[PDB]
Amino acid sequence: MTTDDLAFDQRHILHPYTSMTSPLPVYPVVSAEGCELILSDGRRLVDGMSSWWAAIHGYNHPQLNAAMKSQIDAMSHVMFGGITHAPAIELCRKLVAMTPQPLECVFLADSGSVAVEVAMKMALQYWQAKGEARQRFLTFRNGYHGDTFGAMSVCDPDNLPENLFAPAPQSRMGEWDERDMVGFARLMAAHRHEIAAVIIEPIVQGAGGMRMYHPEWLKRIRKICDREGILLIADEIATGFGRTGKLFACEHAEIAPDILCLGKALTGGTMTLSATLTTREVAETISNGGCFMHGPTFMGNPLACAAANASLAILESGDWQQQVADIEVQLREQLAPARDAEMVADVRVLGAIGVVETTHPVNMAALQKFFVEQGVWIRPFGKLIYLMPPYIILPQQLQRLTAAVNRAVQDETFFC
Amino acid sequence: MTTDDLAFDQRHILHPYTSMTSPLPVYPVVSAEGCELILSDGRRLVDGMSSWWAAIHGYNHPQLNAAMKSQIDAMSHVMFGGITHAPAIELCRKLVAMTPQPLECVFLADSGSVAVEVAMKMALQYWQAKGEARQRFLTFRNGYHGDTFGAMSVCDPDNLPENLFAPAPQSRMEWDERDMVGFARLMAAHRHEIAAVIIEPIVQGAGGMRMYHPEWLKRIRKICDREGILLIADEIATGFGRTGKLFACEHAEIAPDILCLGKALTGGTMTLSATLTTREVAETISNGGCFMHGPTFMGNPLACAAANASLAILESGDWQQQVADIEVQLREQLAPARDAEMVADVRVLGAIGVVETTHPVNMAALQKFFVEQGVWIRPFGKLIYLMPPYIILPQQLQRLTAAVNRAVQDETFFC
Ligand SMILES: *Cc1c(COP(=O)(O)O)cnc(C)c1O
Ligand SMILES: *Cc1c(COP(=O)(O)O)cnc(C)c1O
Ligand SMILES: C[C@H](N)C(=O)CCCCCC(=O)O
Ligand SMILES: C[C@H](N)C(=O)CCCCCC(=O)O
Ligand code: NA
Ligand code: NA
């Protein structure tokens, strides 16, 4: 990269969630390997974010690289309208088999938000097919489901058609207080017949606050959903594939949703792909009202399916459990001291999710710069300095992250 | 693939736009090369659809294959939040330079519908930043903008917050000023409610493969300027040479405020998308503090590199003669279809060859018939259209056109 290259990026390219007149410093990355990002000048950085939590196996993984290259040799892409192929079949076989039994119908999509939008669409076609007029969604405060319009209608109004917003689950993953239930039950009482589906992120509410709630909630919500005949959508785009300690975070409550959304770590953070699973009752009902009105251009893409197949195969070894278990232990030990810093408000850890919540909103440009100077890549956000590293990170690499996090919260320097 | 593999596909996997209790036959494809799709049994098929019009250079293209493999060796992906890289910079340099001058701000995304949703969001944030309450979109009948919710709100209600739908452009690609009163009438009534105008330039694809007169874009651009309203051009289907010009807006010699790109952007290798806007639009948004959007795999190194390799192939300029000759060749060879009794109209433009029928086709039976002719064509509704790769051989074009002509001889494959 050159300096004219970097002037160009800043003047012409919009980055995610930032200003075009006031971009925040960007760091030029030329390649990646293991759990490190290599910069244009040679500096290496320990990745604590997993490229927004998708790169669970790290970067430049030989199994992933081979899969992708093999598939390119056959075909990166072919349409899926009236055509099918090995990579997609393989992937749907794995997806059906690794998820709760009821979930056996797979609709492949290209990105997380489309996966949510598809789920929403299934929910709505479902009721229309049965003649019921159910159009609202009951979700929770602090939920995040993506940026397209449909997804934006179910995100928290703070963090467009009106949906119902129940209180953020208060009970931590921690004692279960039955009082936490009122808000939700009241809204369900009032709108039960308007509600097409309940949509939530299981256990961990990610972008909406990195909030860890009690598994009993899923137990209850599932029981209420069954009672009323309403569908349960579980948005596991962030939680899926071992992040929280279990393969799917719904396992913690030993329940199955009617619709399950997947993405992010689905492909090993190699490239975009997504999946929305449902049940036979949901898929058949839809068809019978004649079809499911959705079909992304690159749906089922041979190249992305193969990468995801290779990433799901890596998880077949089982090694992620001990890996996430030890990362959980190690984040707990090493962030504990952050409970003594004055900028800290709370420390919560779960699986390979290490969160340090602050009293004051961070100054990203200055905090980012600080982490880069420590040899680590951490992207704070709001009042959250959280780690979500690849499962195969070395203990010493985990130590530099936690050390840099602890140092960052010692005083107000990097705050506000 | 096995027979248990194919039972599994039919019982567990939903395909695009079809039923789960009544899927339509699917054909098992093991690989692709040149302009052919190779099936599990060995049969080869000339592709007349370009994999839903993305594969403009065909399949297993050495330049594309090399680009993708090189980038995988460096990294398929890294996040874009606070990070930038060569492939994206390269791509945005090419996108800025090949599009009208005003369009210099690029927001990379993952798919066609997200590109539209991003455009829509830009339109709305723009007005909000200026204090105006503008929330509706003025689009056209027969427009198709994708399947996510926002996109569904501007698709034709026949082919959800209520937008405004001016009558479809009638003027075939003579011009006539009457076309305009409807659009004009709706604009008169709602000018201050309208945040943006959104349309597919010249060719309205999925909504009917309709080719309209370039004067429309000239007029719409002039009205938009008059009223201070933004012009979104959805070139996800038309972009990168499909209609004979690099961008279909060229036909009218105009620039939209926001341009949506996808499909052929990457050469049909994998998904990627782009929404371009102007500095006035990008800066206004920032100043109301930011643009609230950021796909997880935004700017993905592997997809950007494939698109860089596909844009480079177009840099040679060879697509112009190629699309010109395909246009001539579709004209000649579909002409006779004007004499068939199932045919209602024949329209051709660039590498877009359309045969419109009187009756809706029976896809399962028509598809089967095309597969038996050694061709891959996916009819739809009343349209049997060809949108083949630009480097197709003349003989390969002949088998498609021949198969299309044969299909419309009688009602066998209809309804
Ligand atoms: C990441 C995420 C999404 C949306 O994904 P994108 O790939 O950003 O479009 C949706 N929901 C949850 C819970 C997520 O974590
Ligand atoms: C293909 C297309 C889209 C949407 O794209 P997807 O990739 O299906 O999500 C939108 N608009 C137009 C004009 C298109 O041709
Ligand atoms: C693929 C994508 N949904 C698109 O933009 C156009 C396809 C619509 C035509 C319907 C069909 O091919 O059956
Ligand atoms: C990356 C993608 N938009 C996503 O799903 C959520 C991550 C949001 C984190 C907010 C931030 O990084 O600043
Ligand atoms: Na299952
Ligand atoms: Na430009």
Q: List chain A residues with CB under 8 Å of B112.
A: 296-297
Answer whether B85 sits within 8 Å of A291, measured CB to CB: no
For residues B202 and B142, is the Cβ–Cβ distance under 8 A?
no
CA distances from A277 to A120, A223, A259, A329, B116 (A): 12, 20, 6, 32, 25
B16 Cα to chain A: minimum distance (Å):
4
Q: How far is CA B303 from the centre of its chain?
A: 18
| B133 and B263 within one domain | yes
| Amino acid letter, residue A395 | P
Cα dihedral A10, A15, A19, A23 sign: negative
Question: Looking at the complex, does the CB of residue A163 fall below 8 Å from at least one CB of chain B?
Answer: no
* Ligand 2 center–CA B378 separation, angstroms: 17
- Which residues of B belong to the annotated binding site for pyridoxal 5'-phosphate? 112-113, 234, 295-296
Per the document, the length of chain A is 416
User: How far lies B176's CA from each of A84, A280, B173, B180, B208, in Å?
Assistant: 46, 53, 12, 8, 21
* Domain's final residue, options B269, B291, B317: B317
Q: How far is the CA of A155 from the centre of ligand 1 (A)?
A: 11
Same domain, B311 and B329: no
For B87, name the nearest residue in chain A, comparing CA atoms only: A30
Domain boundaries, position A392: 1-60+319-413
Instruction: Say if residues B17 and A293 touch (Cβ distance below 8 Å).
Output: yes
CA B52/CA B235 separation, integer angstroms: 14
B-contacting residues in A 337-396 (Cβ below 8 Å): 364, 368, 379
Clarify whether residues B342 and B313 are in a common domain: no
Instruction: For chain A, report the end-to-end CA distance as a whole number of angstroms.
Output: 32
- A3 with A121, same domain: the answer is no
Q: And the tokens for B314?
A: 């177009």
Same domain, A18 and A129: no
Same domain, yes or no: A83 and A202: yes
- When divided into structural domains, chain B yields a total of 2
Method: X-ray
Q: Cα–Cα distance between B309 and B14 in angstroms, integer? A: 32
Q: Find out whether B277 and B258 touch, Cβ atoms under 8 Å.
A: yes
Residue B321 CB partners (closer than 8 Å, separation 6+): none
Contact B197, B231 (CB under 8 A): yes
| A56 and A87 within one domain | no
Cα B175 to Cα B177: distance, rounded to the nearest angstrom: 7
Query: Angle A393-A54-A355 (CA atoms, 0-180°, nearest 5)?
Result: 65
**What Rg, from alpha-carbon coordinates, does chain B have?**
21
Cβ neighbours of B287 (radius 10 Å): 14
Helices (H), ranges, B288-375:
301-315, 319-334, 363-372
CB atoms within 10 A of CB A286: 26
DSSP string, A133-186: ---EEEEETT----SSHHHHTTS-S------EEEPPP-SB-----GGGGHHHHH
Query: Which among B4, B17, B41, B158 is annotated as catalytic?
Result: B17
Q: How far, in Å, CA of A48 to CA of A42, rounded?
A: 19
Pairing state between β B36-39 and B27-33 = antiparallel
**Which residues of chain A make contact with B235, given a CB cutoff of 8 A?**
none
Q: Are residues B230 and B324 in the same domain?
A: no
Alpha carbon of A373: minimum distance to chain B alpha carbons (Å):
14
| B168 touches A: beta carbon within 8 Å | no
State whether B148 and B289 are in the same domain.
yes
The radius of gyration of chain A's CA atoms, rounded to the nearest angstrom, is 21
CA distance linking residue A192 with residue A201, whole number of Å: 20
Q: Which two tokens stand for residue B143?
A: 């427009």
* Residue A193, helix vs strand vs coil: coil
Cα–Cα nearest to A413, from A378, A347, A369, A348: A369
Residue bearing the CA closest to ligand 2, atom 15: B237
Name the amino acid, one letter, at A259: I
Q: Is B349 helix (H, G, I), strand (E, B) or coil?
A: strand
**Residue B34 and residue B60 in contact, taking contact as beta carbons nearer than 8 Å:** yes
Instruction: Report how far apart, in Å, the C-alpha atoms of B302 and of each of A31, A322, B98 are.
Output: 12, 31, 21
Phi-psi region of B268 (alpha: psi -120 to 50; beta: other; left: phi over 0): left
3 state SS of B278: strand
Q: Are residues A355 and A381 in the same domain?
A: yes
Residue after which a domain boundary falls, among A276, A302, A318: A318
Nearest Cα residue to A58 out of A290, A301, A365, A390:
A390
Interaxial angle between packed helices A364-373 and A395-408, expressed in degrees from 0 to 180 and rounded to the nearest 10: 140
List the 278-317 stretch of B: residues with Cβ below 8 A of A: 279, 282-283, 285-287, 289-300, 302-303, 306
Pick the residue from chain A with its C-alpha nearest to B275. A14
Q: CA angle at residue A200 from A316 to A147, to 5 degrees?
A: 95
Residue for token pair 């736009």: B17
Tokens of A221: 């919500």
Domain boundary (B287, B317, B347) is at B317
A275 residue type, one letter: A
**First-last CA distance in chain B:** 32
My answer on whether B43 and B89 are in the same domain is: no
CB of A182 less than 8 A from some CB of B: no
Same domain, yes or no: B104 and B11: no
Query: Which residues share a beta bridge with A347?
Result: A356
d(CA A266, CA B342): 46
- Cα A372 from chain centroid? 24
Residue to mutate among B14, B22, B53, B73, with most A CBs inside 10 A, is B14
At A175, which CATH number?
3.40.640.10
**A334: which 2 tokens?**
């090493």
CATH code, domain with A393: 3.90.1150.10
Any atom of ligand 4 within 6 Å of the Cβ of A149: no
